Amino acid sequence: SWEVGCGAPVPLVKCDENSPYRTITGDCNNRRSPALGAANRALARWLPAEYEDGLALPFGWTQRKTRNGFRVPLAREVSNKIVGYLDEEGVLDQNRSLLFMQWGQIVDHDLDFAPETELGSNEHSKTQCEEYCIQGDNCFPIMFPKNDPKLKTQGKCMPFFRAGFVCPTPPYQSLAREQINAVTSFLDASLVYGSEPSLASRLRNLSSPLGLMAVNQEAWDHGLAYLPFNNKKPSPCEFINTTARVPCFLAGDFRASEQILLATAHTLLLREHNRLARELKKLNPHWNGEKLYQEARKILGAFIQIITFRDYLPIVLGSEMQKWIPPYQGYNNSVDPRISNVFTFAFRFGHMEVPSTVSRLDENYQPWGPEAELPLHTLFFNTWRIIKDGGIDPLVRGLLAKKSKLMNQDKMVTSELRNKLFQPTHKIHGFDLAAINLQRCRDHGMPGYNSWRGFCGLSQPKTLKGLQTVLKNKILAKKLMDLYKTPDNIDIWIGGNAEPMVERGRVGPLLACLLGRQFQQIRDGDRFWWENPGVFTEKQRDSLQKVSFSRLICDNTHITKVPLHAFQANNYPHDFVDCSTVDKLDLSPWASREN
Ligand code: HEM
Ligand SMILES: *[C@@H]1O[C@H](CO)[C@@H](O[C@@H]2O[C@H](CO)[C@@H](O)[C@H](O)[C@H]2NC(C)=O)[C@H](O)[C@H]1NC(C)=O
Ligand SMILES: *[C@@H]1O[C@H](CO)[C@@H](O)[C@H](O)[C@H]1NC(C)=O
Ligand SMILES: *[C@@H]1O[C@H](CO)[C@@H](O)[C@H](O)[C@H]1NC(C)=O
Ligand SMILES: *[C@@H]1O[C@H](CO)[C@@H](O)[C@H](O)[C@H]1NC(C)=O
Numbered sequence: 001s002w003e004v005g006c007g008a009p010v011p012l013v014k015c016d017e018n019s020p021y022r023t024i025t026g027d028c029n030n031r032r033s034p035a036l037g038a039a040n041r042a043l044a045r046w047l048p049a050e051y052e053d054g055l056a057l058p059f060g061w062t063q064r065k066t067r068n069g070f071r072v073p074l075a076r077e078v079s080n081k082i083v084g085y086l087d088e089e090g091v092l093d094q095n096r097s098l099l100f101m102q103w104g105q106i107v108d109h110d111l112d113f114a115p116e117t118e119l120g121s122n123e124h125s126k127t128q129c130e131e132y133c134i135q136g137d138n139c140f141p142i143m144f145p146k147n148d149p150k151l152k153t154q155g156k157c158m159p160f161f162r163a164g165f166v167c168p169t170p171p172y173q174s175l176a177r178e179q180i181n182a183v184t185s186f187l188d189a190s191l192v193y194g195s196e197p198s199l200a201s202r203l204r205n206l207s208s209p210l211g212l213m214a215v216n217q218e219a220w221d222h223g224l225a226y227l228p229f230n231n232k233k234p235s236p237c238e239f240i241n242t243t244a245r246v247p248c249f250l251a252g253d254f255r256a257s258e259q260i261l262l263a264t265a266h267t268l269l270l271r272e273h274n275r276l277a278r279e280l281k282k283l284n285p286h287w288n289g290e291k292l293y294q295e296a297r298k299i300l301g302a303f304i305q306i307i308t309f310r311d312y313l314p315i316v317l318g319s320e321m322q323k324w325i326p327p328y329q330g331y332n333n334s335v336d337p338r339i340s341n342v343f344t345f346a347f348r349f350g351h352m353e354v355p356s357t358v359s360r361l362d363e364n365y366q367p368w369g370p371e372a373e374l375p376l377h378t379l380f381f382n383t384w385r386i387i388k389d390g391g392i393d394p395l396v397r398g399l400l401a402k403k404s405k406l407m408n409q410d411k412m413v414t415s416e417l418r419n420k421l422f423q424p425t426h427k428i429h430g431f432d433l434a435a436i437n438l439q440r441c442r443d444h445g446m447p448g449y450n451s452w453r454g455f456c457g458l459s460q461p462k463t464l465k466g467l468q469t470v471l472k473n474k475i476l477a478k479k480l481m482d483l484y485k486t487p488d489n490i491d492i493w494i495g496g497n498a499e500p501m502v503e504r505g506r507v508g509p510l511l512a513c514l515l516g517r518q519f520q521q522i523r524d525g526d527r528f529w530w531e532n533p534g535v536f537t538e539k540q541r542d543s544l545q546k547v548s549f550s551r552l553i554c555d556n557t558h559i560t561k562v563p564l565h566a567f568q569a570n571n572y573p574h575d576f577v578d579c580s581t582v583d584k585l586d587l588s589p590w591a592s593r594e595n
């Protein structure tokens with residue numbers, strides 16, 4: 001039979017069965033099944049979960065118990081042997097800007113977030129995990145292998161807490177564990193506006209009825225707005241520098257200050273909200289607060305969708321683009337728009353595109369001072385370098401004129417992330433995002449590499465030579481077989497990312513399939529998609545199709561030189577034009593014809 005029973009944890013509401021606009025929660029998008037795509041529900045399962053015990057225990061949990069007859073290797077051992085490298089020279093991407101990386105992290109924070117089992121603060125279990133590395137319940141620590149330098153320096157393990165899961169989070173039901181997506185599955189700027197009414201309210205400025213969003217207080221960017229500081233303690237953005245005690249920014253997503261360029265993009269998006277509102281007020285002085293909020297929010301959502309599907313996905317998927325995301329033919333109400341559990345790993349391809357430095361540049365795109373270029377690890381949870389060291393314009397020029405790192409089968413993840421990651425609960429820049437990724441795959445009950453290859457209609461290699469042929473890399477295939485013993489056992493994160501990239505794209509065949517499928521679904525299954533007849537007018541759409549990331553910059557910074565195509569590599573000055581070059585968003589089709 002069939003049942004949509006379990007999953008009561010209740011963002012449960014009444015559906016204003018038309019209404020002009022999206023809810024914050026994404027409830028009500030689909031009329032038949034109105035929970036589809038909403039925040040705080042279980043990630044969808046494209047294939048059944050694969051746990052050690054059928055139900056909840058990750059592969060790797062029990063020493064004795066094999067996967068397919070073989071021990072799964074320690075995550076940190078895979079990270080040491082395959083993902084790591086020493087030399088940063090020659091590793092940059094020659095036709096993608098750093099914006100290409102940064103935009104990917106933005107789009108990802110819009111689509112999926114699977115927070116850890118908190119069990120609140122004031123907890124002895126957090127001490128028991130970190131301090132003692134004792135595995136139990138939600139403590140699943142990453143153990144260092146023998147030979148790991150971190151053994152000498154750091155202790156026995158890196159702490160790691162299992163992701164929260166639906167129905168209960170403490171004692172669990174029966175039938176396989178399903179992890180939570182805390183944000184809305186729609187591409188809808190939920191990272192700006194929030195995925196909960198609660199946070200979505202804190203974000204609004206509810207004093208003056210101009211539909212604006214709350215802005216900063218103490219700090220001003222050469223006359224331009226910053227996001228507001230966040231309330232809560234302890235705050236990691238103060239912990240990194242206790243003398244500057246600048247806190248993290250508050251935003252529609254938890255992780256908004258995780259790194260200084262993510263913060264920086266959140267500023268661009270907020271400024272654009274207020275510019276939309278302010279000018280929508282000018283044209284329509286008879287529109288009340290909410291009306292200005294929801295009409296701005298609606299335009300920004302279109303912008304995120306347009307940049308993404310028109311500029312971003314073409315240069316990720318390249319040649320596979322139109323194989324997995326065919327031309328739009330309209331809204332299909334029978335399309336599942338929920339984000340899949342697997343997509344939350346596939347989209348971590350981003351991690352191999354993060355370079356080891358960030359640069360601040362001046363008006364001539366030359367180094368912004370003596371410490372212009374900094375190591376990435378100094379910039380985790382770093383809000384102060386924005387306030388003290390001259391605002392976001394120097395960083396935004398770095399985003400335009402500098403490069404993404406290129407995925408490389410011999411240089412996968414920079415040591416800035418693989419050895420010096422900072423985690424909020426903990427005190428050191430000593431963690432490994434690659435290890436975390438692999439451990440998290442297992443946490444989430446992921447099927448292995450070959451199940452996903454099958455899912456996407458690709459060959460399933462069983463030998464050393466088959467793998468060598470798929471990866472087109474003898475040494476890599478060999479290291480993978482030495483750790484995992486069968487390609488059946490290869491974690492999807494590392495499996496997917498090990499494939500050579502498709503022509504004109506930045507991911508291999510499996511990933512392009514997993515990603516392409518998921519983006520297709522969230523476009524097709526979105527009743528508020530910007531191109532679905534009646535969402536915007538003919539004249540509105542025509543105006544929206546003119547937007548560009550370069551126009552957004554011009555209007556939200558003190559930069560007057562931008563490239564026409566912001567995501568590819570753009571050298572100053574050959575590729576740069578005056579802001580007057582760039583098409584401006586014409587808001588004159590948002591004049592209300594009430595009368
Ligand atoms: C300095 C850059 C970045 C840092 C420091 C960073 C850090 C992280 C951290 C700490 C997590 C949580 C890991 C876990 O516990 O499982 C995470 C998750 C994730 N990251 Fe990144 N990341 C970066 C860039 C990117 C980029 C460029 C993309 C995509 C283009 C990306 C996509 C994701 C996705 C999809 C998740 C899973 C989110 C979920 O929970 O559903 N990240 N990242
Ligand atoms: C909400 O927007 C209003 C309107 O711009 C801001 O209200 C101002 O608050 C400052 C504080 O001294 C002063 O300019 C005036 O009291 C208000 N100005 C106006 C034009 O009304 C307010 O700053 C915004 N609130 C937040 C949290 O950003
Ligand atoms: C860079 O990518 C763009 C995407 O539009 C492409 O058209 C162009 O050929 C590429 N440039 C180089 C230098 O390969
Ligand atoms: C902390 O910030 C102050 C300025 O507030 C700066 O002079 C100092 O170098 C910073 N130190 C670190 C470790 O970031
Ligand atoms: C919507 O998608 C489903 C399943 O992918 C398909 O079978 C159906 O024909 C589509 N709906 C319409 C109205 O074409």
Ligand SMILES: [Ca+2]
Binds near residue numbers: 183184189190191
């Ligand atoms: Ca969303």
